[PDB]
Amino acid sequence: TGLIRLQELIKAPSRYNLRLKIRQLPADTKDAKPLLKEMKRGKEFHVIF
Amino acid sequence: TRWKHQVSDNKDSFYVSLYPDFSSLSRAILDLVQFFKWKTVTVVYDDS
Numbered sequence: 001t002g003l004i005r006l007q008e009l010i011k012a013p014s015r016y017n018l019r020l021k022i023r024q025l026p027a028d029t030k031d032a033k034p035l036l037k038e039m040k041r042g043k044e045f046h047v048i049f
Numbered sequence: 050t051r052w053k054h055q056v057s058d059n060k061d062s063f064y065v066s067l068y069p070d071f072s073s074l075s076r077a078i079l080d081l082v083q084f085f086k087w088k089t090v091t092v093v094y095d096d097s
Contacts, residue, residue, distance in 0.1 A: 004097050
């Protein structure tokens with residue numbers, strides 16, 4: 001349901017030169033460490049939570 | 050008989066649905082896209 005809450009951001013590359021990646025937190029709340037490792041892998045620096 | 054979204058912590062377990070689940074269908078769509086060697090694709094939807 002959060003993609004409803006952020007749908008204008010996803011539609012925003014249709015009008016701007018903005019590149020975005022989209023990732024989902026796991027079902028376990030404590031399993032964020034592979035997600036932060038994947039943040040480390042791709043070297044992204046601008047995260048919207 | 051129709052797809053609906055489910056709340057991730059809905060504890061009701063007395064329902065089944067024969068609609069094909071869109072995780073597997075989206076995996077099929079992504080595999081079909083990966084077969085066609087595409088790079089730029091535009092996803093057009095109707096309702097949110």
